[PDB]
Short mmCIF file of all heavy atoms in Angstrom, two decimals:
data_model
loop_
_atom_site.label_atom_id
_atom_site.label_comp_id
_atom_site.label_asym_id
_atom_site.label_seq_id
_atom_site.Cartn_x
_atom_site.Cartn_y
_atom_site.Cartn_z
N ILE A 166 48.65 -103.06 25.03
CA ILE A 166 50.08 -103.29 24.92
C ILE A 166 50.29 -104.40 23.90
O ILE A 166 49.70 -105.48 24.01
CB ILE A 166 50.70 -103.67 26.28
CG1 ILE A 166 50.49 -102.54 27.29
CG2 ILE A 166 52.18 -103.98 26.11
CD1 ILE A 166 50.94 -102.91 28.69
N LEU A 167 51.12 -104.13 22.90
CA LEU A 167 51.48 -105.11 21.89
C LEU A 167 52.80 -105.75 22.26
O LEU A 167 53.78 -105.05 22.55
CB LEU A 167 51.57 -104.46 20.51
CG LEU A 167 52.11 -105.35 19.38
CD1 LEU A 167 51.09 -106.42 19.00
CD2 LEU A 167 52.48 -104.50 18.17
N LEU A 168 52.84 -107.08 22.27
CA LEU A 168 54.06 -107.81 22.59
C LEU A 168 54.86 -108.02 21.31
O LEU A 168 54.37 -108.61 20.35
CB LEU A 168 53.75 -109.16 23.24
CG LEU A 168 55.00 -109.99 23.57
CD1 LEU A 168 55.82 -109.32 24.66
CD2 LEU A 168 54.62 -111.41 23.97
N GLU A 169 56.10 -107.52 21.31
CA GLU A 169 57.05 -107.79 20.24
C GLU A 169 58.23 -108.56 20.82
O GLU A 169 58.52 -108.47 22.02
CB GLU A 169 57.52 -106.49 19.57
CG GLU A 169 56.45 -105.86 18.68
CD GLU A 169 56.91 -104.59 18.00
OE1 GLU A 169 57.96 -104.05 18.40
OE2 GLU A 169 56.21 -104.13 17.07
N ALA A 170 58.90 -109.32 19.96
CA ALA A 170 59.98 -110.18 20.42
C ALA A 170 61.03 -110.31 19.33
O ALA A 170 60.75 -110.10 18.14
CB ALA A 170 59.47 -111.57 20.83
N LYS A 171 62.25 -110.66 19.74
CA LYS A 171 63.32 -110.86 18.77
C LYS A 171 63.04 -112.05 17.86
O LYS A 171 63.17 -111.95 16.64
CB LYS A 171 64.65 -111.05 19.51
CG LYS A 171 65.86 -111.21 18.59
CD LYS A 171 66.10 -109.96 17.76
CE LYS A 171 67.40 -110.04 16.97
NZ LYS A 171 67.38 -111.09 15.92
N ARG A 172 62.63 -113.18 18.43
CA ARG A 172 62.41 -114.35 17.60
C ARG A 172 61.11 -114.20 16.81
O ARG A 172 60.07 -113.78 17.35
CB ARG A 172 62.41 -115.64 18.43
CG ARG A 172 61.24 -115.87 19.37
CD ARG A 172 61.26 -117.33 19.80
NE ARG A 172 60.40 -117.61 20.95
CZ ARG A 172 60.81 -117.55 22.22
NH1 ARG A 172 62.06 -117.22 22.50
NH2 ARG A 172 59.96 -117.83 23.20
N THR A 173 61.18 -114.54 15.52
CA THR A 173 60.13 -114.18 14.58
C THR A 173 58.80 -114.84 14.94
O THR A 173 57.74 -114.21 14.85
CB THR A 173 60.55 -114.56 13.17
OG1 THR A 173 61.83 -113.98 12.88
CG2 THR A 173 59.55 -114.07 12.15
N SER A 174 58.84 -116.12 15.35
CA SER A 174 57.59 -116.84 15.58
C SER A 174 56.77 -116.21 16.70
O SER A 174 55.54 -116.10 16.59
CB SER A 174 57.90 -118.31 15.90
OG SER A 174 58.67 -118.43 17.08
N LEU A 175 57.43 -115.76 17.78
CA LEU A 175 56.70 -115.10 18.86
C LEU A 175 56.26 -113.71 18.44
O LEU A 175 55.14 -113.28 18.76
CB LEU A 175 57.57 -115.04 20.12
CG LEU A 175 56.96 -114.34 21.34
CD1 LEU A 175 55.61 -114.94 21.71
CD2 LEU A 175 57.92 -114.41 22.52
N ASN A 176 57.12 -112.98 17.73
CA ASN A 176 56.74 -111.65 17.24
C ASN A 176 55.54 -111.73 16.31
O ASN A 176 54.68 -110.84 16.31
CB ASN A 176 57.93 -111.00 16.54
CG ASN A 176 57.75 -109.50 16.36
OD1 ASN A 176 57.92 -108.73 17.30
ND2 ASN A 176 57.42 -109.08 15.14
N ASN A 177 55.46 -112.80 15.51
CA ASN A 177 54.39 -112.93 14.52
C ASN A 177 53.02 -113.13 15.15
O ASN A 177 52.01 -112.96 14.45
CB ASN A 177 54.69 -114.10 13.58
CG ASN A 177 55.69 -113.74 12.50
OD1 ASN A 177 55.92 -112.57 12.23
ND2 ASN A 177 56.27 -114.76 11.87
N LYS A 178 52.95 -113.51 16.42
CA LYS A 178 51.64 -113.73 17.04
C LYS A 178 50.88 -112.43 17.24
O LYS A 178 49.65 -112.43 17.24
CB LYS A 178 51.81 -114.46 18.37
CG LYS A 178 52.34 -115.87 18.24
CD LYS A 178 52.40 -116.57 19.59
CE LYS A 178 51.02 -116.68 20.21
NZ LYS A 178 51.06 -117.39 21.52
N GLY A 179 51.59 -111.31 17.40
CA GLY A 179 50.93 -110.04 17.63
C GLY A 179 50.06 -110.02 18.87
O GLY A 179 48.97 -109.43 18.85
N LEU A 180 50.51 -110.67 19.94
CA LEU A 180 49.73 -110.73 21.17
C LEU A 180 49.53 -109.34 21.76
O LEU A 180 50.44 -108.51 21.77
CB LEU A 180 50.43 -111.63 22.19
CG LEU A 180 50.55 -113.12 21.86
CD1 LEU A 180 51.51 -113.80 22.83
CD2 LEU A 180 49.19 -113.79 21.89
N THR A 181 48.31 -109.09 22.24
CA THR A 181 47.97 -107.82 22.86
C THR A 181 47.35 -108.06 24.22
O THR A 181 46.74 -109.10 24.47
CB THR A 181 46.99 -107.00 22.00
OG1 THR A 181 45.76 -107.73 21.85
CG2 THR A 181 47.58 -106.72 20.62
N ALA A 182 47.50 -107.07 25.11
CA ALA A 182 46.89 -107.10 26.42
C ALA A 182 46.20 -105.77 26.68
O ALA A 182 46.73 -104.71 26.33
CB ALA A 182 47.93 -107.36 27.51
N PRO A 183 45.02 -105.78 27.28
CA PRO A 183 44.28 -104.53 27.50
C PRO A 183 44.80 -103.75 28.70
O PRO A 183 45.25 -104.31 29.70
CB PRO A 183 42.84 -105.01 27.73
CG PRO A 183 42.99 -106.38 28.29
CD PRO A 183 44.24 -106.97 27.68
N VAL A 184 44.73 -102.43 28.57
CA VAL A 184 45.07 -101.49 29.63
C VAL A 184 43.78 -100.81 30.06
O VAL A 184 43.14 -100.12 29.26
CB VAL A 184 46.12 -100.47 29.17
CG1 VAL A 184 46.47 -99.52 30.31
CG2 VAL A 184 47.36 -101.18 28.66
N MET A 185 43.39 -101.01 31.32
CA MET A 185 42.05 -100.65 31.75
C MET A 185 42.00 -99.55 32.80
O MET A 185 42.88 -99.43 33.65
CB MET A 185 41.34 -101.89 32.31
CG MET A 185 41.29 -103.07 31.36
SD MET A 185 40.21 -102.69 29.78
CE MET A 185 38.55 -102.18 30.67
N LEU A 186 40.94 -98.74 32.74
CA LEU A 186 40.54 -97.85 33.82
C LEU A 186 39.26 -98.41 34.41
O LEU A 186 38.21 -98.41 33.76
CB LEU A 186 40.33 -96.42 33.32
CG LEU A 186 39.65 -95.49 34.33
CD1 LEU A 186 40.51 -95.31 35.57
CD2 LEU A 186 39.32 -94.14 33.71
N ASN A 187 39.35 -98.93 35.63
CA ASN A 187 38.17 -99.42 36.32
C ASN A 187 37.34 -98.25 36.82
O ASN A 187 37.87 -97.35 37.48
CB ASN A 187 38.56 -100.34 37.48
CG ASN A 187 39.07 -101.69 37.00
OD1 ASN A 187 38.57 -102.24 36.02
ND2 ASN A 187 40.07 -102.23 37.70
N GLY A 188 36.06 -98.26 36.50
CA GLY A 188 35.18 -97.17 36.84
C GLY A 188 34.89 -97.09 38.32
O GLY A 188 35.32 -97.91 39.14
N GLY A 189 34.13 -96.06 38.68
CA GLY A 189 33.77 -95.80 40.06
C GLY A 189 33.18 -94.42 40.22
O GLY A 189 32.41 -93.96 39.36
N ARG A 190 33.54 -93.74 41.30
CA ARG A 190 33.08 -92.39 41.56
C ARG A 190 34.22 -91.57 42.14
O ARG A 190 35.07 -92.09 42.86
CB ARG A 190 31.87 -92.37 42.51
CG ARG A 190 30.66 -93.13 41.97
CD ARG A 190 29.47 -93.00 42.90
NE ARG A 190 28.24 -93.42 42.24
CZ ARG A 190 27.53 -92.64 41.42
NH1 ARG A 190 27.96 -91.42 41.14
NH2 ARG A 190 26.42 -93.10 40.87
#
């Protein structure tokens, strides 16, 4: 997931968060 924001300084960071599938059986 990429974080976008109205204010330029926060948008410019390009922060990302992982989306995970935890393994198993």
Side-chain angles (χ1 to χ4, degrees):
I166 299 173
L167 173 71
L168 179 67
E169 287 180 347
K171 182 63 173 66
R172 70 166 166 269
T173 306
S174 62
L175 178 55
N176 196 77
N177 280 342
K178 294 183 61 179
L180 295 168
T181 62
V184 181
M185 305 295 304
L186 168 63
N187 287 323
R190 300 184 165 279

